[PDB]
């Protein structure tokens, strides 16, 4: 059995007093006119989903419904037996069908009636709102509006995915789910919420929320924007099976002197950077270009590894904006350098050692020696590798182990071409890119077209259909019927009338002309 939740499931979103005001807030509320499951206690204690939070309501005569169990495997136990409310988070053993008769991290001890509750779990806190009110109705939930107040807030840190109710045996109840919807809450003169608008229920509610009013005057209003959503994603990278020789840079037997640093070129390979970032062998791992955890999603036209030995106190000089004995004379980085500087202590590898010597960006100008000894930290040798990333939108050759997909065309998709992402429809192109051009650009510097990373063909990118959404309505004093115009779109992805102004849904197309009342556009009213 199921019922109509009507306007139930609203609560005071915070602990602030307000009056004579319409307040807009986004929180987990029961959607208006939602579908809620109807349970009975006649002649029924199932395990139900918790999802993002649960709306619970019950109608009582003899106080049969007394509690709930929340958790995963089914643990938070809430029971109201007589006058003593008991809340526990303990490793209690439950039955396959728990009921009442007519290791702990937390513990607390304190139809004729309608009892409403809201149960939501945010950042480890189990928040309970409630309201009690007298009723005179057996058949179903009463229709009407009331806002629930916060009562209990349990600092547990509990994972809740499912819950179960508790009945006393010798009382119907309803279960709904909360959604992150915006509501316009109407506070009367005494600060009581007396009404509410569900901003994602229908186009009239959207208009009421947009105008921050429970009354809408006759006319046409722009309340939202229509956007076609992607159905699937596309991940494209060159089909390269060779892996990048980072091990040959970092695990090298010997490193070069700082005055004569080595430069190893990395290309046409799969670059797994999780090894370098997660490894605990490094004393420092500072990125100036991109975050170290994004390295396996984005990719480069090339990577260069600059390998050399410095003193520990010289580590601070290998950075954009720095100056000094190394930064100015031995190894200079661009102040707009893109890349990561990785270094580690080599005291047990290099020290004895006078074979290491020191004296524009990336200049190798070919004189003093270092005295590296095992008993020296600031004067101990460090092995430093600088990974210079050319991340300009050129053909990529050095990309991480990101799983690829096939290519989907003539549909709205979420695409990734060599680390470049966006949403749009991929179509056939008659454009010809030069051999060195991987991406094209529009006036806004957005991607216009791409060369497919695996196939040497050009795809045009046409961002998914969108436009403003306007609600056409008579004043709410006469009617709550509305019609909706989807601006500058076809009657495709969206009693339908196609006009030059867009796709008009809900208005009847009439052959007889009339003096203009509510204008739509392009000769249509």
């Amino acid at each position, epitope marked *: 059995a199921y019922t109509n939740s009507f306007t139930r499931g609203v609560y005071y979103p915070d602990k602030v007093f307000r009056s004579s005001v319409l307040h807009s807030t986004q929180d987990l509320f029961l959607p208006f006119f939602s579908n809620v499951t109807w349970f009975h206690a006649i002649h029924d204690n199932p395990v139900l989903p918790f999802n993002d939070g649960v709306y619970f309501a019950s109608t009582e005569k003899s106080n049969i419904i007394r509690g709930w169990i929340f958790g995963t495997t089914l643990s938070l136990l809430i029971v109201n037996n007589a006058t003593n409310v008991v809340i526990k988070v303990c490793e209690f053993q439950f039955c396959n069908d728990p009921f009442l008769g007519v290791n702990c991290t937390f513990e607390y001890v304190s139809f004729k009636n309608l009892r409403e509750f809201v149960f939501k779990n945010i950042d480890g806190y189990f928040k309970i709102y409630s309201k009690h009110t007298p009723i005179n109705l057996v058949r179903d939930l009463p229709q009407g509006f009331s806002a629930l107040e916060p009562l209990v807030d349990l600092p547990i840190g509990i994972n809740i995915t499912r819950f179960q109710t508790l009945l006393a045996l010798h009382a119907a109840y309803y279960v709904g789910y909360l959604q992150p919807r915006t509501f316009l809450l109407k506070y009367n003169e005494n600060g009581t919420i007396t009404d509410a608008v569900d901003c994602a229920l229908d186009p009239l509610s959207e208009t009421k929320c947009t105008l921050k009013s429970f009354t809408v005057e006759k006319g046409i209003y722009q309340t939202s924007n229509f956007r076609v959503q992607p159905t699937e994603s596309i991940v494209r990278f060159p089909n390269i*099976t060779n*892996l990048c*020789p980072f*091990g*040959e840079v970092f*695990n*090298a*037997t*010997r490193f070069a002197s700082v005055y004569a640093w080595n430069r190893k070129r990395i290309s046409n390979c799969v670059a797994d950077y999780s090894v370098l970032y997660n490894s605990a062998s490094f004393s420092t791992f500072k990125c100036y270009g991109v975050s170290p955890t994004k390295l396996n999603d984005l990719c480069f036209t090339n990577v260069y590894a600059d390998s050399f030995v410095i003193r520990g106190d010289e580590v601070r000089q290998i950075a954009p904006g720095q100056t000094g004995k190394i930064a100015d004379y031995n190894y200079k980085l661009p102040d707009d350098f893109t890349g990561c500087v990785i270094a580690w202590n080599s005291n*047990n590898l290099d020290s004895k050692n006078y074979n290491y010597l020191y004296r524009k960006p990336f200049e190798r100008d070919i004189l003093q020696s270092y005295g590296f000894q095992p008993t020296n930290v600031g004067y101990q040798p460090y092995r430093v590798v600088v990974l210079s990333f050319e991340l300009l939108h050129a053909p990529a050759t050095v990309c991480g182990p990101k799983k690829s997909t096939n290519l989907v065309k003539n549909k709205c998709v979420n695409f990734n071409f060599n680390g470049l992402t966006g949403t749009g429809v991929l179509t056939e192109s008659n454009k010809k890119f030069l051999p060195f051009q991987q991406f094209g650009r529009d006036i806004a510097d957005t991607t216009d077209a791409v060369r497919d990373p695996q196939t040497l063909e050009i795809l045009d990118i046409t961002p998914c259909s969108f436009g403003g959404v306007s609600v056409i309505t008579p004043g709410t004093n006469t009617s709550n019927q509305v019609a909706v115009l989807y601006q500058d779109v076809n009657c495709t992805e969206v009693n339908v009338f196609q006009t030059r102004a867009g796709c008009l849904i809900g208005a009847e197309h009439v052959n007889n002309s009339y003096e203009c009342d509510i204008p739509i556009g392009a000769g249509i009213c």
Partner: antibody
Amino acid sequence: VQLVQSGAEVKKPGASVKVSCKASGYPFTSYGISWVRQAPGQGLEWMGWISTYNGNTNYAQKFQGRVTMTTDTSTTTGYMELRRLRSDDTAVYYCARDYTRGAWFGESLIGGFDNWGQGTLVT
Amino acid sequence: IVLTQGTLSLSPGERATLSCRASQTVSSTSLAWYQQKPGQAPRLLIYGASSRATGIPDRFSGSGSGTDFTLTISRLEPEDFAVYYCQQHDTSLTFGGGTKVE
């Protein structure tokens, strides 16, 4: 990671032997292939090293001009052909995954012959 | 660079020291130690003179410099009765004679 090789063979002096090796569980082109021989009653002798990435091959002076190494990345295999055999060449020939020299750059690494196969006896 | 390492007689539970000497100084990061059980291929235990190879028990440890390096076993197991070899690989590839542990 596992390495497997061909079975045992018997050859007469002047003959050649083609010793094969197959491997799996790792990126083939990231690691080289090293060959080590062990004559009965003897210790280990290095014969050579081949890059699975670019064909760069190094040999022990003892086998320069006697051994030809080659790889095939499409089957994940490597081969070592020993020409102009002598009775002096009796040994078990072992194939190992190499992290002693870089597969891409040819430079020395900190590591060794990290994963050895069973080895094959050639008389 | 020729390496020199005949039979070490020790009971299970005793500490073993296995020596390797080079005719020339070698890089401290280019020494590897292997363990070969009879009838089996050798396996890598220690690399870079002192670093422990993946899958190798903590009872194995190495150290050294110049021309004098060692491999030690804190406590011998019945599974350690194998021939241990030292490998020099900074300048060409050389193996030592091999030390037998009983």
